[PDB]
């Protein structure tokens, strides 16, 4: 019950709930809480939350959650990120 799988635009991003729980107040912080099945899109057959967003930049967002420093991917426009 420590692992959580985010399905962002069809790409499965997997992480521990502690990682999401680091940065409070943000959307993924609300994901990490146990009252998240009702709040967010979720299918119990695969145990994944689905967000209809660009996955390539969510990699860097989740990297912010993991390491603690926010960086900009040099392969997307400024406004996109």
* Partners of residue 13 on adjacent β-strands: 6
Residue 71 assigned ligand-binding role: yes
Interface residue with a second copy among 9, 33, 39, 47 (CB under 8 A) is 47
Binding partner selected for residue 77 from Zn ion, a second copy, none, CB under the kind-specific 5 to 8 Å limit: Zn ion
Q: How many CB atoms lie within 10 A of CB 40?
A: 14
Examine residue 74 and tell whether it contacts Zn ion (CB under 5 A): no
Task: Give the helix/strand (H/E) hosting 45.
Answer: none
Helical spans, DSSP H, in the chain: 17-22, 27-32, 55-67
Binding partner selected for residue 44 from Zn ion, a second copy, none, CB under the kind-specific 5 to 8 Å limit: a second copy
User: In the complex, which residues of this chain contact Zn ion (CB under 5 A)?
Assistant: 77
């Amino acid at each position: 019950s420590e692992r959580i799988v985010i399905n962002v635009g069809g790409t499965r991003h997997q992480t521990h709930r502690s990682t999401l729980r680091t940065l409070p107040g943000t959307r993924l912080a609300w994901l990490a809480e146990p009252d998240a099945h009702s709040h967010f899109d979720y299918d119990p057959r695969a145990d994944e939350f689905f967000f209809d967003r660009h996955p390539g930049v969510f990699a860097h967002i989740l990297n912010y959650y993991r390491t603690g420093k926010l960086h900009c991917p040099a392969d997307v426009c400024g406004p996109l990120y």
